[PDB]
Amino acid sequence: LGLKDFLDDLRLDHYQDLLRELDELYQKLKQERQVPLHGDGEAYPLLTLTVDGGEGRAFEELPLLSFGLVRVAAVGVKGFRLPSIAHLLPGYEVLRDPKGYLEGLLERSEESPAADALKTFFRATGISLEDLGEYYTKDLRAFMGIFRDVLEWAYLVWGVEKVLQESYKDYLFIKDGRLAQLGVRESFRSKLQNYFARKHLLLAGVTKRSEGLTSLVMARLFAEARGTFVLQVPQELMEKAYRYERQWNADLEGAFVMGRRYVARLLEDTFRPQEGVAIFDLPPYLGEEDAVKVARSLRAHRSVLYGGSVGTVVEAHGRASVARSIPRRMEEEILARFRKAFGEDLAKKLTEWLRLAD
Amino acid sequence: LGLKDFLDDLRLDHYQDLLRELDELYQKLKQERQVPLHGDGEAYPLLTLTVDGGEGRAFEELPLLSFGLVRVAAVGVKGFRLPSIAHLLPGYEVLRDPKGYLEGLLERSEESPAADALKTFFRATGISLEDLGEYYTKDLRAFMGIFRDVLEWAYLVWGVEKVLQESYKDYLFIKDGRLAQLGVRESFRSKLQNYFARKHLLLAGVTKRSEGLTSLVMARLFAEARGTFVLQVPQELMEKAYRYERQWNADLEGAFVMGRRYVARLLEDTFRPQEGVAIFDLPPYLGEEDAVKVARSLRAHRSVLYGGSVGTVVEAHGRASVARSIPRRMEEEILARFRKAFGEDLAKKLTEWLRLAD
Amino acid sequence: ESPIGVVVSSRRNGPWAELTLVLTPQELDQGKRLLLGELVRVSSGGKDYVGMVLDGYYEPVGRSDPTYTLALAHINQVDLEKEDPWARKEVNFYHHRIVLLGRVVQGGLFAPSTRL
Amino acid sequence: ESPIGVVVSSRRNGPWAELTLVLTPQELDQGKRLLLGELVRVSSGGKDYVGMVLDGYYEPVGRSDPTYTLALAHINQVDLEKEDPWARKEVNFYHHRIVLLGRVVQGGLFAPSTRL
Amino acid sequence: ESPIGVVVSSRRNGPWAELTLVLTPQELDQGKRLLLGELVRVSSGGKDYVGMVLDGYYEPVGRSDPTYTLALAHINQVDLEKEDPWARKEVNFYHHRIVLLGRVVQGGLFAPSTRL
Amino acid sequence: ESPIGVVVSSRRNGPWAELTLVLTPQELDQGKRLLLGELVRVSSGGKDYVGMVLDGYYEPVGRSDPTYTLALAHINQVDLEKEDPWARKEVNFYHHRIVLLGRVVQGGLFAPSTRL
């Protein structure tokens, strides 16, 4: 093989420099205050929201001949749930005209729950399309993520203001991700904060793992500390994490969490260093007691599936997932409808192109 | 799996104009000379270049606890090769704070082969670190990509300077990938172009497929194509491909091939639509006769290993690849070396950190 | 009155035609079970065959790791009957194998085995 | 007056030649079945053979998880036929085995088996 | 009074019913073992059966390569019990096989084997 | 006077050497075939042998799913010899197995089997 080729001028000093910041951060974490959970408490129901999807065959490399997919599903305590919003993304139209599709989707408001939710969210939060900036129009890859994030927020707000207008106030809403929106103007974040602030809505976002350095050091801390407990993440640790994440993926600039991070260990015993640890964020109008109650509810609603999970999160994700044969069946359905709408002579060429295109 | 959530109001009207433009492009391609390419004849030898590099485990998640690999190998004829360069990009070092690593490596007193190649390339071509721009300092991924591309260019120039002073004029240099530089200044591109024009170097870039390639419409019209032939991609196809690339990927401002592009068909029976087709580009200072000579050489060096590959390209790639045992052995050897230079408890602390995560 | 489980396979094994059955977590928790050697009724296309439960075993369903899940839940003393409905529902399944013996026809004549 | 299914394999198993047959969801819904031991006609390159259905079994076609799909549909009380026609079109398959006894020769003697 | 291990399978093997048992690293460290041929009591749905340890073997649990892990630890002179507690906490598993002989019923009788 | 197929394997099966043969789709469409028990000539290192065709079977070549491809084509009712040549060209393969009896030497004397 010849591994000696990379063994020319090995350097070993950056490791010495690195083994000072981690030590300092560990010492800082040792200075925190731990709030244990004694297998009890005053908890209230949860309501998780998540968005999933996939892509059609060859869409990644030849999007002008394929399509996209997005589905949103939610599950809450007592077996309650909201209707699922789904949408199909035409690769060709979006590729050839960014912003030429979102406006039409907003205007239709005829039968698509996605368009209905977008209209409802915009009209309710007073958010303007100029706020989203040019990040989603930079290219298709950015636009897809922007659309998915906006649709997640729109589903949350639309459900809140359409289905649960008086019974929504007793539920803890869970988000499958950090409480941060990246790639949009600060107007969007300010409007979201105000809407969740005036409403006093109980919202807590679960990040799981994507958190790298934070989990690295928190597992070490748990190696010494014992029991189920929670502790606020130090501000210096959060700032260093943001600096590292920015220096790694500049596109993530501005995605700071609108709140503070808490870490609660859900499982007393585990077979691996980083199992049964929950990282969640809270809105600025939530205090230490609110964080304690959120941690207690999460611990009560824990699961042992994926090395310790919040349970409702995994159930909602499983419900909202997209079948891997769904893209193929959708492609066949699209071809059938194209035939039945335009004619038969115009489908043979499309099928031949598809056959010649892997 | 709960289909029909995507079937509501498909709105597939655009497929009509999609296929219309596809048929127009096929019609345009129809009128291109397909010179017969029967193998027997005279041709140049080849000197392929290929770059590759592995990575440590969880490089993306924690690039501050891993490293990087970048290797370049050139294969000539049968055993007429040149020394292979190996470089180790530390995760923490300057990857966490660029703008200093390049200067340090250029001023490397030890003068490792990679640094020597970089210095020789800069000196010969007259391209300073200023013309590179600030893209390579935007983030770690951009720095890695720009470093890989510039290292391959430096390897090519260093080989053409220090190992082939005279015979380099009777060699058909084949460079993997399209002839283009992305994320570098037009000044850098023009410097490379004019240096190549002055050197009168025999060059051609060979690619199979993804990035975005609508030029693979060649798959159609290959039926009853009468075996091999040489063709030049139409300007309409080139413009459409460039526009689609800049629409989808973005940041592909520099992707235009520094010259014209020819598409060939090495084989005559493939079992699949897109086998045995080579897309090789040429610099502006090479005429159709040079294109024919290069096509004959490529046909002479044809293979069937990967479904009609150029043979020498795959041979070079095999010798320039990186396995996983190499990163693992590098990890263990660097861990061992750390002890001699910096205590023992520090090494044990680092080992405990590694055990606790990645 | 209602089906016991969901049939998920069928085949011919030697001279007898068999078909696998799966009992879901909901049915297993309601307390429904099949006794080895029992006689049951199989409906297929308007005809009523006769079956005899032969075998019974445990096999994972879907993408799951019952061994790891159960071990991890055990070390933490998690009462699956009260704390982890999702893990219980993911790992609670059971398979049975049934053989068709014939079918009563007309005034009572019993036609052995089957060809369909 | 058209093929019952699609042939997807062939082989020589001992002194006899077999060939696998697959019944698609359309033919299964229309009501077309094959009784074990039935005699069928096999055409291969313009010649007519005589075949006998030997076996029959269920096997997934493509990248599918019939057990998971059926179990989930049963759990959610989802009636496949009326509610998820797209989910009943990817598990509704069935395989068969056929053996070529020989070729009938006009004005001559039945030619046993086959060397082709 | 506490259960020994965690049952992670069950099936009818020939004329006898049997189930698989796993001893977690914690239990192994505490010194809990099972002797081949030993008699144990199995509780299942409000009934008490009589079991008998039949087999014993080592098999990996989860996503791990115990051979590679142990070989590397031995090579690097690492003492797993002290220096690397986490490496020893994912390979210290052990399996067992238990057969249900019957169950004691009423006032001194014994119903052999089992159908559930 | 051109090779019928391409040899793609070989081994020492008991006391007789053997090698596998593959018929490509182009040859299969031209009409070439091999009859079981046929005698064929094998060239290897400048020496001609005498081989007998022993067995024949269908096995996929490359990364393909012949079952799914053919079933989908049948469902969509597309003639597989006039509409989708690129799909008919990747499933039309077929394997043969051949045994080397020996080679003739000198004045017609038969050298049995082969040590090479």
mmCIF file of C-alpha atoms in Angstrom, chain A residues 1-3 5-7 9-12 14-16 18-19 21 23 62 64 69-71 86-87 90 92-93 95 108 110-111 138-141 212 216 220 244 247-249 273-274 323 326 329-330 333-334 337-338 342 352-353 356, chain B residues 1-3 5-15 17-19 21 60 62 64-65 71 86-88 90 92-93 96 108 139-141 213 220 247-250 273-274 325-326 329-330 334 337-338 342 346 349-350 353 356-357:
data_model
loop_
_atom_site.group_PDB
_atom_site.id
_atom_site.type_symbol
_atom_site.label_atom_id
_atom_site.label_comp_id
_atom_site.label_asym_id
_atom_site.label_seq_id
_atom_site.Cartn_x
_atom_site.Cartn_y
_atom_site.Cartn_z
ATOM 1 C CA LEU A 1 0.000 0.000 0.000
ATOM 2 C CA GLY A 2 2.795 2.399 0.915
ATOM 3 C CA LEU A 3 1.535 4.314 3.942
ATOM 4 C CA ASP A 5 4.203 8.345 1.825
ATOM 5 C CA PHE A 6 2.242 10.483 4.304
ATOM 6 C CA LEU A 7 4.919 9.935 6.993
ATOM 7 C CA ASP A 9 7.076 15.625 8.078
ATOM 8 C CA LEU A 10 4.534 14.590 10.706
ATOM 9 C CA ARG A 11 3.579 17.442 13.047
ATOM 10 C CA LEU A 12 2.508 16.964 16.662
ATOM 11 C CA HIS A 14 -1.413 21.445 17.196
ATOM 12 C CA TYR A 15 -2.510 18.539 19.402
ATOM 13 C CA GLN A 16 -0.659 20.100 22.339
ATOM 14 C CA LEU A 18 -5.757 21.706 21.319
ATOM 15 C CA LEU A 19 -5.373 19.925 24.650
ATOM 16 C CA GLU A 21 -9.167 24.580 25.215
ATOM 17 C CA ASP A 23 -9.441 21.127 29.317
ATOM 18 C CA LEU A 62 -30.142 15.155 -13.786
ATOM 19 C CA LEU A 64 -34.278 18.521 -15.279
ATOM 20 C CA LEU A 69 -40.741 15.232 -2.507
ATOM 21 C CA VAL A 70 -41.617 16.698 0.891
ATOM 22 C CA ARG A 71 -44.008 15.506 3.605
ATOM 23 C CA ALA A 86 -47.383 16.809 1.224
ATOM 24 C CA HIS A 87 -46.115 18.389 -1.981
ATOM 25 C CA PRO A 90 -40.941 19.684 -10.239
ATOM 26 C CA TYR A 92 -37.411 21.469 -14.274
ATOM 27 C CA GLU A 93 -39.631 24.412 -13.308
ATOM 28 C CA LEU A 95 -34.345 24.822 -11.880
ATOM 29 C CA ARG A 108 -53.184 28.893 -5.775
ATOM 30 C CA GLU A 110 -57.068 25.869 -4.061
ATOM 31 C CA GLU A 111 -56.439 22.303 -2.864
ATOM 32 C CA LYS A 138 -28.787 31.503 -4.926
ATOM 33 C CA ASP A 139 -29.399 28.006 -6.312
ATOM 34 C CA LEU A 140 -31.627 24.942 -6.127
ATOM 35 C CA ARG A 141 -29.772 23.281 -3.250
ATOM 36 C CA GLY A 212 -20.182 17.705 18.155
ATOM 37 C CA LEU A 216 -17.858 15.382 23.205
ATOM 38 C CA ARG A 220 -16.946 13.186 29.586
ATOM 39 C CA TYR A 244 -16.301 26.391 15.044
ATOM 40 C CA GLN A 247 -15.506 28.352 10.395
ATOM 41 C CA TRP A 248 -16.561 24.908 9.152
ATOM 42 C CA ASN A 249 -19.727 25.794 7.170
ATOM 43 C CA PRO A 273 -20.347 7.012 25.911
ATOM 44 C CA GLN A 274 -23.060 9.212 24.394
ATOM 45 C CA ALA A 323 -41.164 5.128 1.035
ATOM 46 C CA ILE A 326 -42.872 6.050 -3.600
ATOM 47 C CA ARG A 329 -44.634 4.841 -8.273
ATOM 48 C CA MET A 330 -44.992 8.622 -8.497
ATOM 49 C CA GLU A 333 -48.238 7.908 -12.159
ATOM 50 C CA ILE A 334 -46.823 11.127 -13.635
ATOM 51 C CA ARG A 337 -51.265 11.310 -16.340
ATOM 52 C CA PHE A 338 -49.038 12.949 -18.958
ATOM 53 C CA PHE A 342 -51.482 15.315 -23.738
ATOM 54 C CA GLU A 352 -37.366 6.671 -24.557
ATOM 55 C CA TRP A 353 -35.442 9.583 -23.043
ATOM 56 C CA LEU A 356 -31.653 6.251 -22.284
ATOM 57 C CA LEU B 1 -46.783 3.784 2.456
ATOM 58 C CA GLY B 2 -49.508 6.408 2.286
ATOM 59 C CA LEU B 3 -49.043 7.449 -1.332
ATOM 60 C CA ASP B 5 -50.425 12.606 -0.852
ATOM 61 C CA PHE B 6 -48.293 13.762 -3.805
ATOM 62 C CA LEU B 7 -50.835 13.023 -6.566
ATOM 63 C CA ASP B 8 -53.009 16.100 -5.947
ATOM 64 C CA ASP B 9 -52.704 18.614 -8.807
ATOM 65 C CA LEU B 10 -49.481 17.332 -10.338
ATOM 66 C CA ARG B 11 -49.288 20.222 -12.842
ATOM 67 C CA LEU B 12 -46.869 18.566 -15.283
ATOM 68 C CA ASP B 13 -47.314 21.042 -18.147
ATOM 69 C CA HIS B 14 -43.615 21.925 -18.436
ATOM 70 C CA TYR B 15 -42.614 18.458 -19.671
ATOM 71 C CA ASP B 17 -41.296 22.359 -23.485
ATOM 72 C CA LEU B 18 -38.680 20.171 -21.802
ATOM 73 C CA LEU B 19 -39.009 17.573 -24.551
ATOM 74 C CA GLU B 21 -35.937 21.775 -26.269
ATOM 75 C CA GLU B 60 -16.893 16.312 8.874
ATOM 76 C CA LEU B 62 -15.211 16.763 14.209
ATOM 77 C CA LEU B 64 -10.680 19.310 14.829
ATOM 78 C CA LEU B 65 -9.907 15.719 15.881
ATOM 79 C CA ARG B 71 -2.095 12.076 -3.036
ATOM 80 C CA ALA B 86 1.664 12.689 -0.406
ATOM 81 C CA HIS B 87 0.355 15.517 1.771
ATOM 82 C CA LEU B 88 -1.246 15.472 5.221
ATOM 83 C CA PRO B 90 -4.055 18.478 9.763
ATOM 84 C CA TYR B 92 -6.657 21.581 13.761
ATOM 85 C CA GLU B 93 -3.450 23.316 12.529
ATOM 86 C CA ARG B 96 -9.149 25.843 11.633
ATOM 87 C CA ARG B 108 8.698 25.078 4.389
ATOM 88 C CA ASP B 139 -14.220 27.607 4.755
ATOM 89 C CA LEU B 140 -12.486 24.276 5.252
ATOM 90 C CA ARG B 141 -14.251 22.507 2.374
ATOM 91 C CA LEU B 213 -24.134 16.759 -17.999
ATOM 92 C CA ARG B 220 -29.227 8.892 -28.302
ATOM 93 C CA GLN B 247 -28.478 27.532 -11.971
ATOM 94 C CA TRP B 248 -28.255 24.291 -9.979
ATOM 95 C CA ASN B 249 -24.889 24.088 -8.220
ATOM 96 C CA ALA B 250 -23.985 27.782 -8.186
ATOM 97 C CA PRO B 273 -26.951 3.163 -23.404
ATOM 98 C CA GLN B 274 -23.931 5.119 -22.132
ATOM 99 C CA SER B 325 -6.249 1.021 6.848
ATOM 100 C CA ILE B 326 -3.991 3.921 5.844
ATOM 101 C CA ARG B 329 -2.443 3.347 10.794
ATOM 102 C CA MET B 330 -1.781 7.077 10.505
ATOM 103 C CA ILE B 334 0.705 9.798 15.192
ATOM 104 C CA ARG B 337 4.851 9.694 17.961
ATOM 105 C CA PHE B 338 3.092 12.225 20.198
ATOM 106 C CA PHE B 342 5.236 15.625 24.509
ATOM 107 C CA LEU B 346 -0.876 14.250 27.720
ATOM 108 C CA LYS B 349 -5.461 12.321 27.967
ATOM 109 C CA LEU B 350 -5.755 12.550 24.181
ATOM 110 C CA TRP B 353 -10.714 11.935 24.529
ATOM 111 C CA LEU B 356 -14.932 9.207 24.604
ATOM 112 C CA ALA B 357 -15.732 10.295 21.045
#
